[PDB]
């Protein structure tokens, strides 16, 4: 009855005031450990991307959400951990670059290979690089991209296009920033042209307002994306019942979700950080946010449901999952919407867990592009940044801080931060390693090459 | 039998501008984690702290020191990581305290019972607890205590003193802030005066200011704690000279190497952050210091010769390294010296993971009590607080940011943070776990009842 364990429970045992009250552990883990390791190959593999969550990030919303003495059983019941490192690379001088942005994270993961800043699916000589999914989709396997975000966005992008700017969203923008890549110049195309190209068998995310625009050259020309699309063979379904009402996609029938113009709805509505403001205002309390709708499928719905269509493929499947807004509202310095993000993550991680668990031959990955800038400090705290109050699940306050930038949004860090997996093979996270190497380490789960 | 391995090498492999070059891993982990899993008794333990050490000020530390395709020799090697929870907890109410101090902390591992920010050895409702050092010399180990801070500092008194205010150092304070610790009024006596009572094997590190201090009650009343230590049958030593002319160390012949009335010496110096410091002013290379001297001990000496002393006895050891500057240098708002020290506990680790890798049951811990300010920021960052860039190994420019505070520190961090290690017992520091765990883990592995 070999079986691989998940933390089925490593919330605070007791009276966390009591003696050994706090401790998570109930005993010795180095049996249980051991009945993590399997080398055995994953047939498939399930990443979970969640944007911009650090280890800030995830202490913050389980001691909100969850209390301190809590635990999300998705975010944190994965076995095998480690840290590992994230810095990009200077296009010009080929030194690293500390802290990187959501593109060139992204193009290591998914490449194999380091690139600067705003580089997608390229290296610093602007060479294309084969992604583990074009690789995986190569290799006959089923392939799945689902974001909360425009697909035309970073994290996603990453795995279908490759183009020298991120902000190549469509045709307009491809043209004026990626000449290069331009379609009526003889280039690849834009993001979503690319995206359209590549043909994952199941994409859900948002961003449907790039393909109102029209192709500059080629094929479909003068006709918008989405007729594009159409004529291509997509299914294309924009909300939860038509999302639901879906029997199969594959090749010959490929799903295209497309749940908002941009980004998707945040969870919960809460105000801006302020600065003084666990001083100058009252704690706060998220709420949820009315619009996330009955009629928008959630991250555990659209995660839940393409582990649904790719199952069917007997080969196996490779499948990434992005929560969005964790990093958009990091910049946004509202911790009521950065940790929303995080609850949702972890709702979409449990659904990935419960399969593979189930399935017994998966490697489910849960891991961040790059650390942020919400601090957890003191209530007293008198800092020079935007701060927050809020009232936790403990019924006690926690004061979330945001103090790297004077400007507009608050800024990516470059700390080394957590990655922990589940499954075969799951035992190339524990440590310090670097994220490309995760990229390898999914090539050879899967037997590539 | 296969005898647990260390990581040897998770430097970059080759290029990092390349395909696989910024890689770290060569192989499949699988087999070697399956030979780092042991379950018997661990015989020794080493504890390595890195007060304020969070992966933000570990990162920033490598990328100095190492570069970011770099690796510590030390601080990673160690096999087995995970990540920890360690909030405190607001006295009077019950619930959780976020943001911890480092006396709060240390107790955590030290006894493990969650007490209230600033407690020494006793619980919310001043109770005092048995503490790790106590119950491992009450078994018949051999105890040391180290740390580069007075002897007095939280995390060193942790090990020994049970008190409700880290500030009652000696008699003069615990008089008027500790009185029910008072030795006048019954108490068990000052942080120092406990020290004492304690007379653990070994005890090296700075604070002798306050051995000047006299007592007012007990059997040495009228006479200095120095005195009293000696005439106790102490054994003091103030520089490196005379510790290495030490041949023993044992419970009728202790050791106490005060090398400092204060804090002992930071590695290297530097310019404190500024307003706008990455803007303004130059990048900056850290200046060795050359005050810091061949007559006082380094960290990773001190470590040396405790072990050896630790060793001979024949029934095992528990030790405590601690690496205090990095939370002052890191409160200083002082990139370079918080560096400095996350450097020189490296050293230390080394040394500690030499000995126990040829002695093949030692467990070695390496962590930190809390979070801190520290951040790694874009060289072209305009932030509301302190910024610093500087000058790495990779010929690159690297820019710290501390932001959290407005007055005279920048504030500890309540992120959940790294937690590695290795030898018999080391599976137990795997996933998330709170720091009280520890307290359990180690009184286990060790076998004390
Ligand atoms: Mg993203
Ligand atoms: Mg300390
Ligand atoms: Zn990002
Ligand atoms: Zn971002
Ligand atoms: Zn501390
Ligand atoms: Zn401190």
Redesign the interface.
Known sequence: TPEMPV?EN?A?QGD??????????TG????A??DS???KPAKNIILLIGDGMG??E???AR?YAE???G?FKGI?A??????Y?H?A??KK???????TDSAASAT?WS????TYNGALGV??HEKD?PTILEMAKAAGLATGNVSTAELQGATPAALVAHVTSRKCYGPSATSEKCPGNALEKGGKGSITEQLLNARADVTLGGGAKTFAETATAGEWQGKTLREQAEARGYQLVSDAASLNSVTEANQQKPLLGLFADGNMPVRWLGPKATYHGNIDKPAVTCTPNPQRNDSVPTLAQMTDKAIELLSKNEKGFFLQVEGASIDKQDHAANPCGQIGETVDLDEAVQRALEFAKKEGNTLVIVTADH?HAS????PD?????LTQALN?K???V??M?Y?????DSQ?H??????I?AYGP?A??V?????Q??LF??MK?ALGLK
Chains 1, 2 share one sequence.
């Open positions: 933390l490593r605070a966390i005031t009591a003696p050994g009250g706090a401790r998570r552990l010795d883990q180095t049996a450990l051991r390791l399997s080398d280890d800030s995830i202490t913050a001691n209390g301190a003495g635990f944190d994965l076995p095998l951990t480690g840290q490192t810095y690379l200077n001088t080929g030194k690293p670059d500390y802290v290591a490449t194999g290979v380091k290296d610093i690089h650390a601090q957890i400090v003191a705290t008198k800092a020079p940044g936790t403990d019924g006690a926690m004061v801080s103090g790297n930038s004077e400007e800024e860090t470059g700390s080394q931060l957590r922990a093979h035992a190339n524990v440590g310090l390693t670097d490309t190497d390898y380490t050879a």
